[PDB]
Amino acid sequence: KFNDTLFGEMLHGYNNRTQHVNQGQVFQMTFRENNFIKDFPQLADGLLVIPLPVEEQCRGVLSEPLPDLQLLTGDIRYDEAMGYPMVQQWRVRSNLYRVKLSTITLAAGFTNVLKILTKESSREELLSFIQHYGSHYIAEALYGSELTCIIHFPSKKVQQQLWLQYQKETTSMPFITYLSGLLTAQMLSDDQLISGVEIRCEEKGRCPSTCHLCRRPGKEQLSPTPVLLEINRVVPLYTLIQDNGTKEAFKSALMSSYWCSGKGDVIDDWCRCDLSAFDANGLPNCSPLLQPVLRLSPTVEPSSTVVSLEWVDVQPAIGTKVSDYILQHKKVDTDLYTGEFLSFADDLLSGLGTSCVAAGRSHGEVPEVSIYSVIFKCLEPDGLYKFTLYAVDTRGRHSELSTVTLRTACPLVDDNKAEEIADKIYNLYNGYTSGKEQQMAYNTLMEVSASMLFRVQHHYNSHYEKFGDFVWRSEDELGPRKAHLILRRLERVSSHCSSLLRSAYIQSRVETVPYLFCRSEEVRPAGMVWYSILKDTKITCEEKMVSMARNTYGESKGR
Ligand SMILES: *[C@@H]1O[C@H](CO)[C@@H](O[C@@H]2O[C@H](CO)[C@@H](O[C@@H]3O[C@H](CO[C@H]4O[C@H](CO[C@H]5O[C@H](CO)[C@@H](O)[C@H](O)[C@@H]5O[C@H]5O[C@H](CO)[C@@H](O)[C@H](O)[C@@H]5O)[C@@H](O)[C@H](O[C@H]5O[C@H](CO)[C@@H](O)[C@H](O)[C@@H]5O[C@H]5O[C@H](CO)[C@@H](O)[C@H](O)[C@@H]5O)[C@@H]4O)[C@@H](O)[C@H](O[C@H]4O[C@H](CO)[C@@H](O)[C@H](O)[C@@H]4O[C@H]4O[C@H](CO)[C@@H](O)[C@H](O)[C@@H]4O)[C@@H]3O)[C@H](O)[C@H]2NC(C)=O)[C@H](O)[C@H]1NC(C)=O
Ligand SMILES: O=P(O)(O)O[C@@H]1[C@H](O)[C@H](O)[C@@H](OP(=O)(O)O)[C@H](OP(=O)(O)O)[C@H]1O
Ligand SMILES: *[C@@H]1O[C@H](CO)[C@@H](O)[C@H](O)[C@H]1NC(C)=O
């Protein structure tokens, strides 16, 4: 049967790869020593439970707002006027205990199988041990009750307004409960600044009755049992072998299961895949080549004619090495069609190239994982684009492909010029007679872009619709092929633009943002069947700046 007690997972053993606790039973649980806490039963022997200080108990932290990274990976889609959808995390910890174990004798069943395997040096056998007992045992861990909530805002603007609106009316109340208060009360009203806000919570261990920051109407509870939150320290199970002969042979079997998928031995810096791990093309397949997740840049919202993308290196610390990243891109309108092919090593770092595409490599969250990036600066406005990415290893395998589809913003529109043209066109249509007027009216309408023509239609109908619709009146005064010609141009404007271009006001802000521009100093030696490691390529990186002109839509100029 399964021996289960509180604190709990410390005696059973932990796997690093699959991240599962309760993997066999490493240490024995006894109750000779008398360890109690509060209302909990008798603790197992040899584990030290220390409640955290009162400063840490029932304390909540509100993270800074960031774009929703999940909504920047696949079919990327958001209102151009809104911007990136934002998320902000709220987290409250309430029933905290720090749990270490020292000192405990080993389990009976653990030592039994440890006694028979220590002489039997076998690979398939040592792997079945790790399946059952895991790889480590937990040395230090944090237990308690934590409530993790995520506030989903529709835009960066909506949040800032809500945060300043909250900061005014509070100066008592946390930010999330103020939002939840206005979310629940919205059943009284309807549309407002809080229209699209959503809150999503997930609880590890129920909220205690004493703490008021994690209190949720019905889920309150008196003295809840603490749940494992963090694993602070792990120690490998080859510490427990007690001999040098087996604990070196066990260690190599552990590295095989972790780094080489259990189908190969690890020489320093790489996996020696035993046959037949090799794939369909006869290339080493024991170390996994992961899918690189292509992302939009969180810091640079795409503008019309411009997109900048990111991805984190898929190269493990041990095993596969990435030699190149292949990035294809096409404008759709098709499907199942191959577009421009860009090798990161050959086309982006070595061959210009510029000034339409630039690449870059940077240090990421915690080195050493690299953050590759590429920026497109000569795209076309109001166009749907598809970017695909895959990695190529040193021995030639392709990774699983990854895709991003998104649309560049609408073209820029001088709203003053549009309302000015609409008046010019109306006073010509009221002049009637001249064929110069007819030609000049047709010329000015055709010489300006389709989005501008859609905007002068919006302005003409806003003012002069009672004396004739823009289309209908253009047909009366100019003739109907010139009309139909004007009219077809309006059809080339998509209708997210056409929706946005029916707004009250369109204003232009100009953002200026940096991007990393890296080039390859050293051309690396490549063989026929093997290639050079892309990470080792020496590169010279320089910071540059893009100016990004954007339209600003709204029903009034106050933002
Ligand atoms: C859950 O479960 C597991 C539980 O254990 C966890 O698994 C552990 O993960 C750790 C983290 O990833 C692992 O630690 C990392 O190991 C790697 C691999 O190191 C081995 O190979 C190295 C390769 O050496 C090359 O170059 C030397 C020249 O000096 C040559 O001699 C070699 O031959 C080899 O290259 C060529 O080999 C042949 C030619 O012979 C050809 O095919 C090619 O030409 C090859 O290129 C090697 O350096 C290591 O050697 C150490 O160990 C020897 C004994 O085993 C010892 O004799 C050595 O002296 C050395 O020990 C000392 O030096 C190292 C390095 O300074 C120290 O780490 C160590 O503590 C000692 O001081 C080893 O054989 C290793 O590369 C990693 O090191 C990088 O990352 C750490 C960050 O942790 C940095 O601090 C380092 O500076 C280094 O960073 C540099 O390199 C990166 C790679 O390019 C680069 O990205 C960086 O920018 C920077 O340049 C780590 O040490 C650990 O091994 C692993 N354990 C097990 C049991 O699997 C798992 O992670 C965990 N998961 C969790 C917790 O989430
Ligand atoms: O050391 P060099 O001069 O750069 O060239 C090595 C050579 O191409 C080996 O054939 C190759 O191993 P295999 O062809 O057998 O796969 C090795 O890769 P590796 O050491 O990472 O295995 C390369 O490093
Ligand atoms: C349960 O605990 C006993 C110690 O009394 C131990 O002998 C037994 O092996 C444990 N059960 C399992 C499945 O490990």
CSV table of N, CA, C and O in Angstrom, one decimal, residues 312-346:
chain,number,residue,atom,x,y,z
A,312,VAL,N,13.4,31.7,-28.1
A,312,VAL,CA,14.4,31.2,-27.1
A,312,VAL,C,15.1,30.0,-27.7
A,312,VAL,O,14.5,29.1,-28.2
A,313,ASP,N,16.4,29.9,-27.5
A,313,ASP,CA,17.2,28.8,-28.1
A,313,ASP,C,16.8,27.5,-27.5
A,313,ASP,O,16.5,27.4,-26.3
A,314,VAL,N,16.6,26.5,-28.3
A,314,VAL,CA,16.2,25.2,-28.0
A,314,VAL,C,17.4,24.3,-27.6
A,314,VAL,O,17.2,23.1,-27.4
A,315,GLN,N,18.6,24.8,-27.6
A,315,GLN,CA,19.8,23.9,-27.4
A,315,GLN,C,19.9,23.5,-26.0
A,315,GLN,O,19.9,24.3,-25.1
A,316,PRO,N,20.0,22.2,-25.7
A,316,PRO,CA,20.2,21.8,-24.3
A,316,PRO,C,21.6,22.1,-23.8
A,316,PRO,O,22.5,22.4,-24.6
A,317,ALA,N,21.8,22.0,-22.5
A,317,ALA,CA,23.1,22.1,-22.0
A,317,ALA,C,24.0,20.9,-22.3
A,317,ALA,O,25.2,21.1,-22.5
A,318,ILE,N,23.4,19.8,-22.5
A,318,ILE,CA,24.1,18.5,-22.9
A,318,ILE,C,23.3,17.8,-23.9
A,318,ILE,O,22.1,17.6,-23.8
A,319,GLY,N,23.9,17.4,-25.0
A,319,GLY,CA,23.3,16.7,-26.1
A,319,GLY,C,23.3,17.4,-27.4
A,319,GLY,O,24.3,17.6,-28.0
A,320,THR,N,22.1,17.6,-28.0
A,320,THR,CA,22.0,18.3,-29.3
A,320,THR,C,22.6,19.7,-29.3
A,320,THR,O,22.5,20.4,-28.3
A,321,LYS,N,23.2,20.0,-30.4
A,321,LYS,CA,23.6,21.4,-30.7
A,321,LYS,C,22.9,21.9,-31.9
A,321,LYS,O,22.8,21.2,-32.9
A,322,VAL,N,22.4,23.1,-31.8
A,322,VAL,CA,21.7,23.8,-32.9
A,322,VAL,C,22.7,24.4,-33.8
A,322,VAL,O,23.5,25.2,-33.4
A,323,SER,N,22.7,24.1,-35.1
A,323,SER,CA,23.6,24.7,-36.1
A,323,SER,C,22.9,25.9,-36.9
A,323,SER,O,23.7,26.7,-37.4
A,324,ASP,N,21.6,25.9,-36.9
A,324,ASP,CA,21.0,27.0,-37.7
A,324,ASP,C,19.5,27.0,-37.4
A,324,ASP,O,18.9,26.0,-37.0
A,325,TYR,N,18.9,28.2,-37.6
A,325,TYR,CA,17.5,28.4,-37.5
A,325,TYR,C,16.9,28.9,-38.9
A,325,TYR,O,17.4,29.9,-39.4
A,326,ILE,N,16.0,28.1,-39.4
A,326,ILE,CA,15.4,28.5,-40.7
A,326,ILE,C,14.1,29.2,-40.4
A,326,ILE,O,13.2,28.7,-39.7
A,327,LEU,N,13.9,30.3,-41.1
A,327,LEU,CA,12.8,31.2,-40.9
A,327,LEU,C,12.2,31.6,-42.3
A,327,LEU,O,12.8,32.3,-43.0
A,328,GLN,N,11.0,31.1,-42.6
A,328,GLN,CA,10.3,31.4,-43.8
A,328,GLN,C,9.2,32.4,-43.5
A,328,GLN,O,8.6,32.4,-42.4
A,329,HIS,N,8.8,33.2,-44.5
A,329,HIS,CA,7.8,34.2,-44.4
A,329,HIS,C,7.1,34.4,-45.7
A,329,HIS,O,7.8,34.5,-46.7
A,330,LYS,N,5.8,34.5,-45.7
A,330,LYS,CA,5.0,34.8,-46.9
A,330,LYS,C,3.8,35.7,-46.5
A,330,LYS,O,3.3,35.7,-45.4
A,331,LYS,N,3.3,36.4,-47.5
A,331,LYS,CA,2.1,37.2,-47.3
A,331,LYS,C,0.9,36.4,-48.0
A,331,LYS,O,1.0,36.1,-49.2
A,332,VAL,N,-0.1,36.1,-47.2
A,332,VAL,CA,-1.2,35.3,-47.7
A,332,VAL,C,-2.3,36.2,-48.2
A,332,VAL,O,-2.4,37.4,-47.9
A,333,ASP,N,-3.3,35.6,-48.9
A,333,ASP,CA,-4.5,36.3,-49.3
A,333,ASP,C,-5.5,35.3,-49.9
A,333,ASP,O,-6.7,35.3,-49.5
A,334,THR,N,-4.3,30.6,-51.6
A,334,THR,CA,-2.9,30.3,-51.3
A,334,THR,C,-2.8,29.1,-50.4
A,334,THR,O,-3.4,28.0,-50.8
A,335,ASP,N,-2.2,29.2,-49.3
A,335,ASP,CA,-2.0,28.1,-48.3
A,335,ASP,C,-1.1,27.0,-48.9
A,335,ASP,O,-1.1,26.8,-50.1
A,336,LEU,N,-0.4,26.3,-48.0
A,336,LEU,CA,0.5,25.2,-48.4
A,336,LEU,C,1.5,25.7,-49.5
A,336,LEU,O,1.8,25.0,-50.4
A,337,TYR,N,2.0,26.9,-49.3
A,337,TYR,CA,2.9,27.5,-50.3
A,337,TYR,C,4.2,28.0,-49.6
A,337,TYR,O,4.1,28.6,-48.5
A,338,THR,N,5.3,27.7,-50.2
A,338,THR,CA,6.6,28.1,-49.7
A,338,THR,C,7.0,29.5,-50.1
A,338,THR,O,6.8,29.9,-51.3
A,339,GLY,N,7.4,30.3,-49.1
A,339,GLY,CA,7.8,31.6,-49.4
A,339,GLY,C,9.3,31.9,-49.2
A,339,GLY,O,10.1,31.0,-49.3
A,340,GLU,N,9.7,33.2,-49.0
A,340,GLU,CA,11.1,33.5,-48.8
A,340,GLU,C,11.7,32.7,-47.7
A,340,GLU,O,11.2,32.6,-46.6
A,341,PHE,N,12.9,32.1,-48.0
A,341,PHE,CA,13.6,31.2,-47.1
A,341,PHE,C,14.8,32.0,-46.6
A,341,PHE,O,15.6,32.5,-47.3
A,342,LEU,N,15.0,32.0,-45.2
A,342,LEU,CA,16.1,32.7,-44.6
A,342,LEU,C,16.8,31.8,-43.6
A,342,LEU,O,16.2,31.4,-42.6
A,343,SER,N,18.0,31.5,-43.9
A,343,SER,CA,18.9,30.9,-42.9
A,343,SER,C,19.4,31.9,-42.0
A,343,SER,O,19.9,33.0,-42.4
A,344,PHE,N,19.3,31.7,-40.7
A,344,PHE,CA,19.8,32.6,-39.7
A,344,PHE,C,21.3,32.8,-39.8
A,344,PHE,O,21.8,33.9,-39.7
A,345,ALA,N,22.0,31.6,-39.9
A,345,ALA,CA,23.5,31.7,-40.0
A,345,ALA,C,24.0,32.3,-41.2
A,345,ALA,O,24.9,33.2,-41.2
A,346,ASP,N,23.4,32.0,-42.4
A,346,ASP,CA,23.9,32.3,-43.7
A,346,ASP,C,23.3,33.6,-44.2
A,346,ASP,O,24.0,34.5,-44.7
